[PDB]
Design a protein around this ligand. Structure first.
Ligand SMILES: CCCCCCCCCCCCCCCCCC(=O)OC[C@H](COP(=O)([O-])OCC(O)COP(=O)([O-])OC[C@@H](COC(=O)CCCCCCCCCCCCCCCCC)OC(=O)CCCCCCCCCCCCCCCCC)OC(=O)CCCCCCCCCCCCCCCCC
Ligand SMILES: CCCCCCCCCCCCCCCCCC(=O)OC[C@H](COP(=O)([O-])OCC(O)COP(=O)([O-])OC[C@@H](COC(=O)CCCCCCCCCCCCCCCCC)OC(=O)CCCCCCCCCCCCCCCCC)OC(=O)CCCCCCCCCCCCCCCCC
Ligand SMILES: CCCCCCCCCCCCCCCCCC(=O)OC[C@H](COP(=O)([O-])OCC(O)COP(=O)([O-])OC[C@@H](COC(=O)CCCCCCCCCCCCCCCCC)OC(=O)CCCCCCCCCCCCCCCCC)OC(=O)CCCCCCCCCCCCCCCCC
Ligand SMILES: CCCCCCCCCCCCCCCCCC(=O)OC[C@H](COP(=O)([O-])OCC(O)COP(=O)([O-])OC[C@@H](COC(=O)CCCCCCCCCCCCCCCCC)OC(=O)CCCCCCCCCCCCCCCCC)OC(=O)CCCCCCCCCCCCCCCCC
Ligand SMILES: CCCCCCCCCCCCCCCCCC(=O)OC[C@H](COP(=O)([O-])OCC(O)COP(=O)([O-])OC[C@@H](COC(=O)CCCCCCCCCCCCCCCCC)OC(=O)CCCCCCCCCCCCCCCCC)OC(=O)CCCCCCCCCCCCCCCCC
Ligand SMILES: CCCCCCCCCCCCCCCC(=O)OC[C@H](COP(=O)(O)O)OC(=O)CCCCCCCCCCCCCCC
Ligand SMILES: CCCCCCCCCCCCO[C@@H]1O[C@H](CO)[C@@H](O[C@H]2O[C@H](CO)[C@@H](O)[C@H](O)[C@H]2O)[C@H](O)[C@H]1O
Ligand SMILES: COCCOCCOCCOc1ccc(C(C)(C)CC(C)(C)C)cc1
Ligand SMILES: COCCOCCOCCOc1ccc(C(C)(C)CC(C)(C)C)cc1
Lengths: 52, 68, 486, 97, 56, 65, 114
């Protein structure tokens, strides 16, 4: 009843959770493993492309 | 007889009341703070006695003359 | 003053008025000729109390995808319809008498009360922008906040009954949509779509020769595939009916359509047999279509849209909220039932959707000019003329409200729109101080429409993730990238 | 730099006298003169004794003749009438219908 | 407090000006700005290191 | 560049707050003038009919008589 | 239909009687009086009266008033006016002829109507 006569903003703060983790986890769960290993090839070939 | 909301003055949340202003550096001016400016008559009491006497006397004079 | 200034051009205005009427007649002839052969019959429906018609865009707002018309010509059509509405005070002398000229003087005083013919400008875009910046933005900037309050107080209800009416999952989205003028942060449109959680599930029953079947994403996908294959009708109808019987079996396994167990709607069971008509244990009398075998299941071509808007429906809005919704959109509102204002709002909705379609045909938003985009956003009621935004912010705003209007719900549309008309005035001259940061800029990429967003839990809001940070975003955003880089 | 018509301190000091009233400050302060000089005590007694007085007068003496007499004899007859009415010898000394 | 008595003493003096008490106001704006500062410094160190790598 | 969601006041923004306060305390001011007027209207009143009255005060509203 | 609302304590009745008793206790607190100058005529039995020991409270509140304590007594002389006029009227000599011709509020007087 005395909510107006308090300062409870510290008792209720916005969480520091990154929602991106929930997104990337759903991304890996849907993909297979050989595509995960392929991404290491896509990155490596991109490095050699920038090198040449 | 009555619910607690009516007694405490609120259904769910007690709302803050704006406090009363004071006007620092001067006397409060309210219906009950007027004796600071207007005391009972004390300056012309003896003149009141004199004027009451003279009013009674002059009224009696002219009334008696009219009646007679 | 403006009275004599407009009387000076009143002779020169009648010719333009009649020319505009002819243009309107020709365009309406074309549009109705197309509509009378390509558009379905949206039947009239009465409200729950069954005294006045009710209107929804899903059934009544049809979009002629394939209208051979330029966007500017449609703008002319709509603007001249509004001019015909504004020509109504000319009837005052013909119903009141020769003394019915003072209303005509009041009409001629303000230029915002007048049609296009009294304007010195020529291009429809410049004319529309002049009218807006002179009269319409000001008229709209004084209805926005009050409309927002009415929408809020429609959701939360009156007399301290929020614990009985509001939902605890739409709470943070409600706050971000309605109280972001406190924070100064931008809004995500998906948080306005979360307001639809107050409503039920919107369904679509296709009517067959046997029973109604609920439409699903799978059945719709199959029908679109069959439509794209361009097969013969002997094969097209066969595949459609195959998908239809499959969906019928699927919903019969689900436990019937969603509508059977929703308050206010329902499918009757088999009729009962009364008294001696009861033949022992068979207390029912099935319909005629029970004789038809299920393999002959064919779509009747008839559809029933059920929005299930238990809190959002325009009927329960009221005498005042409807009028303010029409005021805020610069539509006619006075001295009419809420049904007529509902139709006016739905017609505005249809106009905006057709304009969106024509814009997408013309090459999107980027093909438009700056004044044309400004005028489009003014028509959508998301910009006020005292802002001076960038082009990217305008494009993002258009994309936002276009997606929001694709959902066919006026309440969330108005909730979104009214947020862009919450401006304050300071009591001091020095404050607000001159800012140090640059003007707000955005892009079409910053708007997340291609992803779903769950409602944030009450008092546990989450930060905003850019679409670019998602995996494979460069592949999903490739269209916008190609449009912007070019 | 206030853009509004800023109100002086003394004007607020004076308006506070008018808006800082409580309910009892009106009720009792206006009820005391009202209850004393009202339809109950003084004004009522006066104005309702006058009716009986002039009824008695017009029945016994007459209003025109009463008007012709002096203020003294007028008051004498008025007092006699007031006594006759207060007594209520015919009502068994009871001011009831 | 006295032997066999307790009392409440009130002064009698006009208050010419209000009495001030330092009640510090909690606000998130300074911490917002400090968080912005820290994140920007992170990105600045990142850019400097990446430039050193790309050029060296 | 200025700060957003801020603008100068306009006629349709209504009066300022101090003006609304001045509107509010007008009944409270007229109270002091009207309660004495109420008491004076009751105290300075005379009845309109007596047992002897051959006439009663009449007030022609529209002067038709 | 089946809303399942929790009990609201504001709808209970557990403060009205305490508040009224608090008001009555504040009233009775002003009845506290010193021993000096105390006198109260008890009944003939020696037991106290009812109104007697609850006059100090009332007059201690009259002390705190501002306008009523100087105005509400001005209707009291009127009581003595009645006390005197009634006795004047109990034995007032009157004319038999006027009483028989114009009796005040007597029944069956056709000039009144009945
Ligand atoms: C007596 C009834 C009250 C007695 C106790 C209450 C009381 O006196 O409180 C003070 C009370 C009010 O206080 P205050 O402020 O002093 O009043 C001013 C006096 O009335 C102002 O008048 P004053 O009393 O000062 O003098 C007027 C003078 C005038 O003398 C005359 O000429 C009158 C001659 C009469 C024959 O009369 C006399 O003093 C004595 C002669 C008899 C009267 O005054 C009175 O009631 C006493 C005088 C009232 C006389 C007329 C009463 C009707
Ligand atoms: C004086 C004599 C003058 C004689 C003049 C005769 C010649 C001049 C004109 C010829 C007449 C031509 C025919 C015509 O005008 O039809 C009009 C009108 C429309 O007919 P319709 O085109 O076939 O309507 C089809 C759909 O309604 C179409 O739906 P919609 O979406 O297009 O518009 C629907 C909207 C109608 O939309 C409009 O027409 C807009 C009207 C405004 C423009 C004017 O709603 C209605 O349909 C109204 C139905 C009335 C029942 C609804 C409940 C009304 C509640 C009234 C307030 C509460 C009453 C007090 C409560 C306290 C007691 C418990 O027909 C009428 O029903 C007229 C009724 C007018 C009186 C209603 C008064 C209700 C209150 C009565 C209180 C109790 C006392 C009575 C006992
Ligand atoms: C019945 C209703 C059935 C259909 C309802 C639709 C409708 O009536 O539209 C009106 C319509 C309402 O506006 P809206 O449809 O919501 O669209 C507003 C725009 O969005 C623009 O909105 P805005 O925010 O820019 O505001 C424009 C502004 C400026 O509006 C103007 O365009 C210029 C002002 C023209 C004033 C015309 C009224 C003259 C009144 C008589 C004055 C005395 C005449 C001379 C002495 C005799 O509006 C005004 O200041 C006042 C407009 C309302 C005036 C009252 C119109 C009476 C309609 C009759 C039905 C209602 C009574 C039942 O009025 C107009 O704005 C145009 C004037 C209409 C002239 C109609 C002439 C027939 C009058 C028949 C009298 C019936 C009397 C019966 C009871 C006695
Ligand atoms: C008395 C307090 C003021 C009276 C105002 C009432 C307004 C009347 C009205 O507008 O009717 C239409 C109004 C509905 O009109 P609407 O379609 O919602 O549009 C509102 C106006 O257009 C909104 O007005 P507007 O924004 O269009 O401004 C134009 C209006 C503004 O001017 C005025 O209405 C009055 C002119 C004087 C004020 C000027 C100050 C500036 O003047 C007009 O030309 C039309 C007025 C006729 O009717 C009602 O809402 C019902 C209210 C009256 C019924 C209350 C109960 C009556 C007593 C029952 C007795 C029997 C029971 C058993
Ligand atoms: C003047 C201008 C006339 C032009 C039409 C006015 C504006 C258009 C309009 O009102 O829409 C028509 C209105 C439709 O309202 P709506 O837009 O559909 O809003 C419905 C929402 O659900 C409702 O949403 P909401 O909740 O926000 O608004 C509710 C609003 C809805 O109310 C309204 O619709 C007010 C509309 C304003 C009307 C203007 C009146 C101005 C009067 C001055 C021509 C008629 C000729 C025939 C006359 C004889 C019947 O208020 C009420 O529900 C209460 C209405 C009744 C109030 C008066 C009750 C008096 C009680 C007396 C005691 C009775 C005791 C006996 C009991 C017996 C034992 C049971 O329907 C009608 O009133 C009948 C239509 C045909 C005649 C209309 C004009 C005359 C009747 C009014
Ligand atoms: C034998 C006669 C009776 C006994 C002797 C005389 C009486 C002695 C007692 C003292 C005098 C009593 C006066 C009696 C007058 C009377 O008859 O009272 C009745 C008369 C009306 O009678 P009529 O209408 O019949 O003439 O009213 C007045 O006299 C007017 C008095 C004005 C009082 C105002 C008080 C204001 C107090 C401040 C309050 C402020 C709060 C805000 C409110 C505005
Ligand atoms: C006893 C037999 C059964 C009958 C029971 C009901 C009797 C009702 C009559 C007594 C009414 C008393 O009415 C009393 O009014 C005051 C107004 O000052 C209310 O007072 C309330 O409102 C005010 C403001 O208006 C608030 O600031 C306050 O906190 C709150 O108490 C009381 O809550 C109520 O109790
Ligand atoms: C059994 O009860 C008998 C008491 O009743 C006395 C009737 O009093 C009439 C009104 O009295 C008041 C005066 C002021 C108030 C307050 C102080 C609560 C007024 C307020 C709310 C403005 C502060 C309440 C009642
Ligand atoms: C608004 O509500 C307040 C109304 O309260 C009125 C209460 O009235 C009763 C007060 O009367 C009394 C009764 C008893 C007493 C005293 C006699 C308590 C008893 C004592 C002093 C002998 C202990 C004093 C005053």
């Amino acid at each position: 009843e005395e909510c107006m006569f308090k300062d409870t903003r510290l008792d209720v703060l916005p969480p520091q959770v990154n929602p991106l983790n929930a997104i990337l986890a759903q991304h890996t769960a849907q993909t297979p493993v050989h595509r995960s290993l392929e991404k290491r090839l896509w990155t490596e070939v991109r490095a050699t492309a920038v090198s040449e | 007889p009555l619910p607690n909301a009516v007694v405490q003055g609120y259904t769910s949340v007690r709302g803050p009341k704006r406090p009363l202003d004071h006007f620092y550096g001067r006397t409060p001016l309210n219906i009950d703070t007027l004796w600071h400016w207007v005391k009972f008559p004390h300056r012309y009491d003896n003149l009141r006695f004199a004027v009451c006497f003279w009013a009674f006397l002059v009224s009696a004079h002219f009334a008696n003359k009219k009646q007679r | 003053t403006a009275v004599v200034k407009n009387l000076a051009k009143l002779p020169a205005a009648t010719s333009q008025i009649l020319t505009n009427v002819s243009k309107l007649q020709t365009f309406h002839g074309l549009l109705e000729e197309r509509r009378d052969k390509y558009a379905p019959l949206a039947y009239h429906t009465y409200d729950n109390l069954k005294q006045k018609t009710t209107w929804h865009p899903i059934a009544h707002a049809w979009v002629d995808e394939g209208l051979p018309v330029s966007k500017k010509e449609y703008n002319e059509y709509c603007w001249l319809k509004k001019d015909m509405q504004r020509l109504l005070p000319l009837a005052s002398p013909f119903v009141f008498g020769i003394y019915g000229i003072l209303p005509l003087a009041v009409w001629l005083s303000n230029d915002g009360y007048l049609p296009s013919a009294f304007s010195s400008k020529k291009d429809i875009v410049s004319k529309k922008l002049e009218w807006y910046s002179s009269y319409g933005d000001d008229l709209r900037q004084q209805v926005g906040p009050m409309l927002q309050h009415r929408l809020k107080r429609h959701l939360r209800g009156t007399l301290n009954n929020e614990h009985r009416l509001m939902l605890d999952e739409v709470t943070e989205s409600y706050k971000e949509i309605f109280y972001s003028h406190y924070t100064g942060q931008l809004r995500d449109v998906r948080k306005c779509a979360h307001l639809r959680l107050y409503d039920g599930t919107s369904t679509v029953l296709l009517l067959t020769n046997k029973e109604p079947v609920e439409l699903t994403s799978e059945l719709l996908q199959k029908w679109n595939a069959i439509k794209a294959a361009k097969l013969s009708p002997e094969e097209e109808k066969k595949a459609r009916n195959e998908a239809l019987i499959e969906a019928y079996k699927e919903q019969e396994l689900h436990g019937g359509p969603h509508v059977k167990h929703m308050q206010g709607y329902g499918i009757p069971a088999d009729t009962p047999l009364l008294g001696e008509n009861a033949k022992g244990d068979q207390y029912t009398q099935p319909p005629e279509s029970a004789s038809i075998p299920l393999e002959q299941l064919e779509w009747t071509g008839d559809t029933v849209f059920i929005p299930a808007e238990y809190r959002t429906e325009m009927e329960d809005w009221g005498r005042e909220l409807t009028k303010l919704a029409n005021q805020f959109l610069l539509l006619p509102w006075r001295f009419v039932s809420n049904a007529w204002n509902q139709r006016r709002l739905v017609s505005w909705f249809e106009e905006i959707l057709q304009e969106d379609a024509l814009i997408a045909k013309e090459g999107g938003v980027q093909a438009l000019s700056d004044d044309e985009l400004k005028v489009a956003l003014l028509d959508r009621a998301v910009i006020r003329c005292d802002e001076e935004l960038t082009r990217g912010d305008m494009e993002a705003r258009y994309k936002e409200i276009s997606w929001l209007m694709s959902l066919r719900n006026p309440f969330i549309v108005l909730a979104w729109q009214t947020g862009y008309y919450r401006s304050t005035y300071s009591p001091e001259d020095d404050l607000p101080e001159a800012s140090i940061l640059p003007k707000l800029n955005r892009t079409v990429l910053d708007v997340d429409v291609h992803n779903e967003l769950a409602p944030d839990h009450p008092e546990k809001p989450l930060p905003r993730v850019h679409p670019a940070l998602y995996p494979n975003s460069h592949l999903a955003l490739a269209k916008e990238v190609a449009v912007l880089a070019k | 730099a206030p853009l509004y018509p800023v109100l002086s301190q003394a004007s607020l000091y004076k308006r506070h006298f008018f808006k800082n009233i409580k309910l009892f400050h009106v009720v009792f302060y206006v009820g005391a003169p009202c209850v004393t000089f009202g339809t109950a005590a003084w004004s009522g007694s006066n104005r309702n004794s006058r009716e009986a007085i002039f009824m008695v007068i017009e029945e016994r003496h007459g209003w025109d003749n009463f008007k012709k007499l002096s203020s003294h004899q007028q008051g004498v007859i008025m007092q006699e009438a007031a006594q006759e009415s207060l007594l209520a010898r015919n009502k068994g000394e009871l001011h009831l219908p | 407090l006295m032997n066999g008595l307790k009392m409440r003493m009130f002064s009698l003096a006009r208050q010419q000006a209000p009495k001030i008490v330092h009640k510090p106001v909690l606000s998130p704006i300074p911490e917002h700005l400090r968080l912005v500062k820290n994140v920007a410094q992170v990105q600045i160190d990142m850019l400097k290191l990446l430039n050193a790598q790309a050029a060296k | 560049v200025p700060v957003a969601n801020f603008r100068p006041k306009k006629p349709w923004d209504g009066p300022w707050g101090i003006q609304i306060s001045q509107k509010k305390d007008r009944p409270f001011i007229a109270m002091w003038i009207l309660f004495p007027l109420l008491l004076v209207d009751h105290l300075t009143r005379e009845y309109y009919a007596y047992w002897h009255s051959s006439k009663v005060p009449v007030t022609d509203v529209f002067g038709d008589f | 239909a089946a809303p399942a609302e929790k009990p609201d304590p504001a709808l209970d009745a557990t403060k009205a009687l305490p508040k009224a008793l608090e008001e009555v206790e504040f009233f009775q607190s002003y009845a506290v009086r010193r021993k000096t100058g105390f006198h109260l005529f008890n009944r003939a039995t020696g037991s106290p009266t009812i109104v007697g020991p609850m006059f100090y409270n009332l007059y201690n509140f009259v002390r705190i008033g501002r306008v009523s304590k100087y105005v509400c007594w001005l209707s009291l002389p009127l009581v003595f006016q009645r006390m005197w006029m009634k006795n004047r009227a109990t034995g007032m000599e009157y004319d038999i002829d006027l009483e028989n011709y114009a009796p005040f509020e007597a029944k069956k007087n056709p000039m009144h109507g009945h």
